[PDB]
């Protein structure tokens, strides 16, 4: 589609495999903001956005957070906190005509810069001056849309390019686009190294009836510490307790007198670790 009519495809309920995308060599630009492409396999996302459009060659750099430009301001705007990846490739073999492909339009003038991630469809005649247009193009009446002159004979920097950007959003929702990872059997009441839909961490998975949790998944404490989590496979309320901490204090007389010590682990009920309590 065109710049001012960029498509947006909803992606959900996926066993998403990004390895085939990474290993493909048909993409000239492969840049990701905030996520390592090799690490895309294990992560789980609640939703994925795929936006596709076609722009000029020199504007591939303009697609980035905190960037300014005609298309950046009047056609397409990226949030400053954007996370995801950007994919773009040349399309001379498909989107070029010797007579000039006139099917691609982009906006020239508008009242003010548009907010990030919003679409403009209205094709009203721009009022560049004071003379009322009244739907009639003329002086002080510029049509905001211009058509790209894409031809196979044009320069490399001017060539048409197809742009597809992937944006990943994460929040406290059940993730539905996960990667090809096998879920293992559950083991509780032991110090394990769990992973609940990307929620990494260590601890012991005791069974606790914390509350009903009719629609909630996570449980938090004073700090950003997930206390209780809801299983993704079945529906039960597990409880996270960190492993045992403490300190090793050494009780010793003077090394001049003798060579003996006595170790003290404070705040440790060492039924699990001449034993004293």
């Amino acid at each position: 589609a065109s710049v001012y009519a960029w498509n947006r495809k909803r992606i959900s309920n996926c066993v998403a495999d990004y390895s085939v995308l990474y290993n493909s060599a048909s993409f000239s630009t492969f840049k990701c903001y905030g996520v390592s492409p090799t690490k895309l396999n294990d992560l789980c996302f609640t939703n994925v956005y795929a936006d596709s459009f076609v722009i000029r060659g020199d504007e591939v750099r303009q697609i980035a957070p905190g960037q300014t430009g005609k298309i950046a301001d009047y056609n397409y705007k990226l949030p400053d906190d954007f996370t995801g990846c950007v994919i773009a490739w040349n399309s001379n073999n498909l989107d070029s005509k010797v007579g000039g492909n006139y099917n691609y339009r982009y906006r020239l003038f508008r009242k003010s810069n548009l907010k990030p991630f919003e679409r403009d469809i209205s094709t009203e005649i721009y009022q560049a001056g004071s003379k009322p247009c009244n739907g009639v193009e003329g002086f002080n009446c510029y049509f905001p849309l211009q058509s790209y002159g894409f031809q196979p004979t044009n320069g490399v920097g001017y060539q048409p390019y197809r742009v597809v950007v992937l944006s990943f959003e994460l929040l406290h929702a059940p993730a539905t686009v996960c990667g090809p990872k096998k879920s293992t059997n559950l083991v509780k009441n032991k110090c394990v190294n769990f992973n609940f839909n990307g929620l990494t961490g260590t601890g012991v998975l005791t069974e606790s009836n914390k509350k009903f949790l009719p629609f909630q998944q996570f449980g938090r404490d004073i700090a950003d510490t997930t206390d209780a989590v809801r299983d993704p496979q079945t529906l039960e309320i597990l409880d996270i307790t960190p492993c045992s901490f403490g300190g090793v204090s050494v009780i010793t007389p003077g090394t001049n007198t003798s060579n003996q010590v006595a170790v003290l682990y404070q705040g440790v009920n060492c039924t699990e670790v001449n034993v004293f309590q």
Partner: antibody, heavy 123, light 108 residues
């Protein structure tokens, strides 16, 4: 896996017209460009005409300008080629090729062809 | 008008040989060349679209190269199913889709 079968080959006098068809069944006909190719009995391939994914851009070879009118029917997956005022040099073999893109003038070339239908221009 | 030329006329090799078919364009076409394998008994097929891009569905034994006014096509083995005629087509100049002459390949 795509099928391209033509019709309309026969024997006609010089200056007389005859009508071609070509049936496509193995793909989606509504979003590809189509071309016609000519194979002389004792020479190589030669391009004749092409039409876009829709009836917007149409181009003809220099030697067949003003004589051929390539049509298209997206409803039943069938294109046409009306040849008018045939001469003796048009007794070649005509193929019904398919373009990889959706435009009549692109680096995209012809990926799938079909068995031709032989025509003769003689008395 | 653009003239499209074929340097070889007829070549012969063996089942374990390696030959190169070259195609020269009079005017620069900027890597916009296509190669077709026309078996004389059935419909022709496509091997390489663009200068050096290999279409899915044919063995990776074939390899193309060249840009501007000089191009080349090579076959690494010439297996017993590769006897056919090869054409080079340009898709960049105003005369639409000018084909080059044939190049027969009979292995013996």
């Amino acid at each position: 896996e795509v099928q391209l079968v033509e019709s309309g080959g026969g024997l006609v006098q010089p200056g007389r017209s005859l009508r071609l068809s070509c049936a496509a069944s193995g793909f989606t006909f509504d979003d590809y460009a189509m071309h016609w190719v000519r194979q002389a009995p004792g020479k190589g391939l030669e391009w004749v005409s092409g039409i876009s994914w829709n009836s917007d851009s149409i181009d003809y070879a220099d030697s067949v300008k003003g004589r051929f009118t390539i049509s298209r029917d997206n409803a039943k997956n069938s294109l046409y080629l009306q040849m008018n005022s045939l001469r003796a040099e048009d007794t070649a073999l005509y193929y019904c090729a398919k373009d990889r893109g959706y435009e009549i003038l692109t680096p995209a070339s012809f990926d799938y062809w079909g068995q031709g239908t032989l025509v003769t221009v003689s008395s | 008008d653009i003239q499209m030329t074929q340097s070889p006329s007829s070549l012969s090799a063996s089942v374990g040989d390696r030959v190169t078919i070259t195609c020269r364009a009079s005017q620069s076409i900027s890597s916009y060349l296509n190669w077709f394998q026309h078996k004389p008994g059935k419909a022709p097929k496509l091997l390489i679209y663009g200068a050096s891009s290999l279409q899915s569905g044919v063995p990776s034994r074939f390899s193309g190269s060249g840009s501007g006014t000089d191009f080349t096509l090579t076959i690494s083995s010439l297996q017993p199913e590769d006897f056919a005629t090869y054409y080079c087509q340009q898709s960049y100049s105003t005369p639409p889709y000018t084909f080059g002459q044939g190049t027969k390949l009979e292995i013996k």
